Amino acid sequence: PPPVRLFGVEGTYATALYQAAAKNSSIDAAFQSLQKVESTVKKNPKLGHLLLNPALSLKDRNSVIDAIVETHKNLDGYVVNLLKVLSENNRLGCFEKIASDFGVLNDAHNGLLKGTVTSAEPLDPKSFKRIEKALSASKLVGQGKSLKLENVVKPEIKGGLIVELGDKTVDLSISTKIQKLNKVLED
Amino acid sequence: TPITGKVTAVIGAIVDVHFEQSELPAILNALEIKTPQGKLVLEVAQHLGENTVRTIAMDGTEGLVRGEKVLDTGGPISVPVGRETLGRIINVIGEPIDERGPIKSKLRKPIHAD
Amino acid sequence: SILEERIKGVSDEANLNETGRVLAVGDGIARVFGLNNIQAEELVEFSSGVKGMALNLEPGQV
């Protein structure tokens, strides 16, 4: 069974898919192809917006799948059997929901963690590396559990940064420090 | 009718049918489900959509295998009436259960009326 | 390409702003999908010549 539980929430699809395609060892292929057919499906404006929309019927949905399997073939036929299942289950809006989850499971099997350096500005390459180094140096990123560290720029945060990974965050931002400082100087 | 379906569910005497076409009955239309209990006459009361109605069953339910064909007989069923309804005790179907045998139709009228 | 062409073909092709198509119905109460621009407490003329006022606007389904 899956090495990690996302506690379903349409992660139940991802889980089922994960173990089935894990024993078929065709999860990387599935994921990439799934991404690829999704990118061009999303970029078909009708049924890249209306695919999300639940306008479509059971019968109309099935005909959408037939168009989708024209868009690519192979690269795990368990995700092709999934397409049918999803149209039948009439959910195709939480399709990318499942895609995201499947990616997490897939890269969990690979043993890769995704962290983030939410910040108010795009930081130095020195900073990027130093944080990536720091995280590996800490046991927080253990070995065989890789790091993709993505610094993001968010305007809502005003100065400083919060590093997050392992559901442990160290938030050394100015916004948060300011919040406590302001509060005590209003109290 | 090409309005045929199968019986998706039988939750009590409130059967659900799934018509295989996007041609649907209407509300207060009538269906005859052919069963080894003869015809069972049901009346569509809700459309739960996606060509799956929820139907009040006006003839008793039991022993029903799921996925049993339906045919749409339309409207509120029309019984057969006359002055030959007089001296007849009739079941829901409209059949003489005092068993003088079938009522001589003159006017057959829909069970639901305005 | 061929995918996009077939996608164009199988798309419903109804704007559904200011109109919308029924999808539940029973009890003199219904739920329609569409009617994106619709006034509240408005009277809506069903194509079977019924009129119904609208009291619930829910995302996508009036």
XYZ file of C-alpha atoms in Angstrom, chain A residues 119-186:
68
model
C 9.670 35.644 0.777
C 8.697 39.155 -0.251
C 11.426 39.375 -2.889
C 13.397 37.004 -5.122
C 16.480 36.208 -3.074
C 20.152 35.769 -3.931
C 21.368 32.559 -5.566
C 23.705 32.465 -2.576
C 20.650 32.545 -0.306
C 18.908 29.791 -2.295
C 21.906 27.500 -2.071
C 22.655 28.301 1.553
C 19.096 27.487 2.602
C 19.101 24.309 0.489
C 22.397 23.354 2.117
C 21.110 24.280 5.558
C 18.027 22.114 5.154
C 20.099 19.097 4.094
C 22.537 19.794 6.950
C 19.611 19.644 9.334
C 18.095 16.210 9.845
C 14.819 17.830 8.706
C 15.768 16.870 5.192
C 16.869 13.336 5.786
C 18.731 11.370 3.184
C 16.917 9.720 0.279
C 14.332 12.408 0.751
C 15.473 14.914 -1.787
C 14.868 18.653 -1.819
C 13.168 20.815 -4.381
C 13.305 24.200 -2.700
C 11.264 26.872 -4.412
C 11.599 30.449 -3.309
C 8.422 32.294 -3.978
C 7.782 35.998 -3.906
C 4.543 36.992 -2.168
C 3.516 40.666 -1.753
C 1.247 39.927 1.244
C 4.359 39.187 3.280
C 6.130 42.482 3.682
C 9.816 41.808 4.086
C 11.636 38.821 5.497
C 10.947 35.178 4.778
C 9.526 31.937 6.019
C 11.147 28.674 5.169
C 8.767 25.767 5.301
C 9.346 22.077 4.865
C 8.586 19.090 7.040
C 5.488 20.918 8.362
C 7.956 22.838 10.438
C 8.534 26.372 9.519
C 10.893 28.905 10.866
C 9.410 32.239 10.133
C 11.892 34.998 10.391
C 9.925 37.543 8.508
C 9.645 41.185 9.378
C 5.872 41.161 8.990
C 5.426 38.677 11.896
C 8.017 40.425 14.124
C 6.282 43.724 13.416
C 2.928 42.146 14.350
C 4.089 41.311 17.866
C 5.979 44.615 18.267
C 2.980 46.699 17.159
C 0.645 44.768 19.429
C 2.671 45.325 22.610
C 2.989 49.039 21.710
C -0.771 49.291 21.382
